[PDB]
Design a protein around this ligand. Structure first.
Ligand SMILES: COc1cc(-c2cnc(N)c(N3CCC(C(=O)O)CC3)n2)cc(OC)c1OC
Ligand SMILES: [Cl-]
Ligand SMILES: [Cl-]
Ligand SMILES: [Cl-]
Ligand SMILES: [Cl-]
Length: 250
């Protein structure tokens, strides 16, 4: 409830994200620093609405947001959440590139399974689905988090023309799983106009051959140009590839 109840250990990323320890029990967590000092009251009311919505999101595959803290003399809002020791998927992918080493299919199956269930929960309740918004804990669990300039690698053909569309999320997941496998996005280009052209032709290289035809097929379906040809979250979870151990475990 009060920032004094926690001790900052060190900064993770820079508002700042920080690893913290709760004094009462020694519990490891993180908080996100939001400086609302230059925000209007209308923007603060907005921010309050968003923070109450985060508190309501309880799901093994979604970053758990525990608390909120206001420091009035620092005009700083702190969002306290679980600590995900594994970092984000972006870093995993960049690690793969450097190591010249592809990720295990088992790992890709875990991400596919757990992110789909995350998405399934988000739809039931009715955000940005990219590697830098997907996090890993210390137990092989995958969690969706974070609810110009640069190219929109994952922008679906519908979003290009015109979402809101749940099949648009499936395309984004396809892009993400594809980049996990090939260590590069399915569609690359130097300009957003070139990119859009590539996206509309709907063509891409098969994921590397170390990955099964079955994994390649489901990712390919998610990247269908027609939103109605992409599998739903339910049809995804029905896939013979997806087994119990791919799901979360406490
Ligand atoms: C240990 O290495 C890293 C950890 C994290 C990290 C760990 N736990 C988190 N809860 C977390 N947050 C930060 C942003 C959140 C938000 O936007 O709501 C959700 C997840 N991050 C992050 C790292 O770099 C990105 C990292 O190093 C690779
Ligand atoms: Cl969990
Ligand atoms: Cl490689
Ligand atoms: Cl085609
Ligand atoms: Cl290839």
């Amino acid at each position: 409830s009060r920032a004094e109840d926690y001790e900052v250990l060190y900064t993770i990323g820079t508002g700042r994200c920080q690893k913290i320890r709760r004094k009462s029990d020694g519990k490891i967590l993180v908080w996100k620093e939001l400086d609302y000092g230059s925000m209007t009251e209308a923007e603060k009311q907005m921010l309050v609405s968003e923070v109450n919505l985060l508190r309501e999101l309880k799901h093994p595959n979604i970053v758990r947001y525990y608390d909120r803290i206001i420091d009035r003399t620092n005009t700083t809002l702190y969002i306290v959440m679980e600590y995900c020791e594994g970092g984000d998927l972006a870093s995993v992918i960049t690690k793969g590139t450097k190591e010249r080493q592809y990720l295990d299919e088992e790992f890709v199956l875990r991400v596919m399974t757990q992110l789909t269930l995350a998405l399934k929960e988000c739809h039931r309740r009715s955000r940005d689905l990219k590697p830098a918004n997907v996090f890993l804990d210390g137990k092989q669990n995958v969690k969706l988090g974070d609810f110009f300039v640069g190219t929109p690698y994952y922008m679906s053909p519908e979003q290009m023309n015109r979402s809101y569309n749940e099949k648009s999320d499936i395309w984004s997941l396809g892009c993400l799983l594809y980049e996990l496998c090939a260590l590069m996005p399915p569609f690359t280009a130097f300009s957003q106009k070139e990119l859009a052209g590539k996206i509309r032709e709907g063509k891409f290289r098969r994921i590397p051959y170390r990955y099964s035809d079955e994994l390649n097929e489901i990712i390919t379906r998610m990247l269908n140009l027609k939103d109605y040809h992409r599998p739903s979250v339910e049809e995804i979870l029905e896939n013979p590839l997806i087994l119990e151990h791919h799901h979360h475990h406490h």
